[PDB]
């Protein structure tokens, strides 16, 4: 089990990621692989993401 994008502080509904805002950790169930912090960046959440959860594909708008 793989490294996960997980919010290091509450990141609110429609804001756009920024690197200050995704840790990586080792986390059950998996959400988006930690290897696309960089290209998260920019990408908007659709939804608040309290500290500590996992970021999944379904909070990010036009992510695939």
Same mark, same amino acid.
Do not use: C, F, H, W
């Given at each position: 089990?793989? $490294?996960?994008? +997980? *919010?290091? =502080?509450?990141? &609110?509904?429609?804001?756009?990621? /920024?690197?200050?805002?995704?840790? *990586?950790?080792?986390? /059950? %169930?998996? @959400?988006? %692989? $930690?290897?696309?912090? &960089?290209?998260? +960046?920019?990408? =908007?959440?659709?939804? *608040?993401?309290?500290? @500590?959860?996992?970021?999944?594909?379904?909070?990010?708008?036009?992510?695939?």
């Amino acid at each position: 089990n793989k $490294a996960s994008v +997980v *919010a290091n =502080q509450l990141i &609110p509904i429609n804001t756009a990621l /920024t690197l200050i805002m995704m840790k *990586a950790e080792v986390v /059950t %169930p998996m @959400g988006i %692989p $930690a290897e696309e912090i &960089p290209k998260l +960046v920019g990408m =908007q959440v659709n939804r *608040a993401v309290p500290l @500590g959860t996992t970021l999944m594909p379904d909070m990010v708008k036009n992510y695939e």
